[PDB]
Amino acid sequence: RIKKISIEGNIAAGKSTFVNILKQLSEDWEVVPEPVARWSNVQSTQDEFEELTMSQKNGGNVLQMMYEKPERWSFTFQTYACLSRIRAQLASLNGKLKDAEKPVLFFERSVYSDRYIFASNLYESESMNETEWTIYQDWHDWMNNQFGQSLELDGIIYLQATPETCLHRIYLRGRNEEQGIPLEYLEKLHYKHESWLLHRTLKTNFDYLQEVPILTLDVNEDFKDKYESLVEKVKEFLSTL
Template structure:
């Protein structure tokens, strides 16, 4: 490539990137964020879903030096966190937030660079739920100590402010269901690491979502976050196999972001 071709490509790409709308889907564990994200992906050609990097947390690559050379192995940080939350919650939240940051910064898929409408990138969760739902909850449960919490908040604020408009959300979709319903769905999907999760943990996370997105009582550090529009969708109904419910939900989303 000549430098002028590269420049033209980069600037057209950057222009498109500036136009992207970014939306995050929030909601309790197992409420159905991935299912709903797939639904959005199939419903609009300008929509691109960036999947949550759970598998990365289940396979953290490590390189260890042995006498006969480097050896690659992997550890399951999600399992370690549930098994010994006091030891691993801070590490887990650091890693999950970093992988989340990477997904927010992911460039637009090539097919959307040509689209005539405004492209929408959809994330399952955000750097904000990492902090104001999970890390805060773990701090309140005593699984993240006050020093770790201060360190977490310091680098989190710094990174979010540094990346500024490149990760700024247009709005939030809150999939809202009772903790009992989420417990049932969690049992049905049977993710091995989540076997020990009790209803009261989901109740705490539910209240954190309610405080942040409905009651607006969570003290947030970022001014723009407090002003973000929130679309609340009833996820109590089983939307996975009901085409009518899916249509209603999609219409609400399209109206909200049009």
Template sequence: MALSQRSASGPAPRRGPRRLSVEGNIAVGKSTFVKLLLKTFPEWHVSAEPITTWQNIQAVGTPIAGPPQSVGNLLDMMYQQPSRWSYTFQTFSFLSRLRTQLAPYPESLLQGQKPVHVFERSVYSDRYIFAKNLFENRFLNDVEWAVYQNWHSFLLQEFHSRILLDGFIYLQASPQVCLKRLRQRARAEEKGVQLGYLEQLHAQHEDWFIHKVTELHFETLKKAPVLVLDINEDFSEEAARQEELMTKVNTFVKNLG
């Protein structure tokens, strides 16, 4: 009976916030863009990429009193010695992203009329951008890639409904523009990043979001809507461009239902 009532009045209203991931190359401007989102839609909630967790791996279970000690900077180790540390990095980046996607919504978000939760990158870009690229460069060997994909698929199937995303915002800029922004930001661990690496990551994004040739292993992911925004231009002083970008995001979110 409940089913027939639903079909008579359209689909059952969905509960919970719309969940979006902002994707894009290194230093394309995701954090900057997300700040603009929050300025425009202050009632939305953003989960930043957990980079400081990767830069300060905490010792666990040490008997010493006081705050946990950092035992290493895994981001730096991965860039310094990718063959040795890429697999370890991907296990930890995935785990921290999974935790972020599983975390309960803040109470304030649930009180909003149209709650939206925005993530900076996702468990999906962990696999279909970064891990895939490391494998294609042989920084993950056949065994590591097979093991990674095995537990990635298993865990995503297990957590299925709790980690679903409603859509992706792909921030697009040329690798040259990303390199300029990366150099300007000057994050210590990224000193050795060259144009070639950004070109590879750009190609991975384009394959997934534009050419749609990346083999995806989750049905919901194949169907997820994608909003592509060109952010080659500096919009920091351009109010009209900012408004144009925010209108596109607003329309995209509204169309998610």
């Protein structure tokens, strides 16, 4: 019964900012954030006895390892990115909004952006070879088939910001791992988003996506400047779902 809406857009477009403010408008609205923290500090579960005397230690930073050496670390990062996402998304689908009249769960990105934007771009850039790309897609396909329609989207909200805006916002936010990202990299990700969500020319292995409704919102302005009209557009869009 929970409607599932993906917020899509480039790095530092303003997705987290927008959606976590937006969700306050209704007790029936919740967000699943992207597990970026879990990527910059890699941890696995402690044993039940061990956790009582041993601290959960800071782990490696796979996000940073990927940015430093994408040709070595991209496949590892993308596999983990998508696994951590699915785990978090399924749990919120299963455990939240059990008392909502019109429950909406907003996902910060989707398994589709993992594959068709980010990993695809890494492949195109030869940061993943043929074997890695085949394995990744094989895995991604298998996992999607395993769930029925459970993660399937009801709608996508595309926050469209220029590569230049995103580059500035990466600096504003100050994530250490992202400070070396050049404009050329953001432009590549921009183009993939435009093909997928705006021009709608991008073909995926998931045919329902060809027909999922998409709301495109320009987020280039300062947050106060367009927020009202954005909220109005979002609410009108949800009414149609």
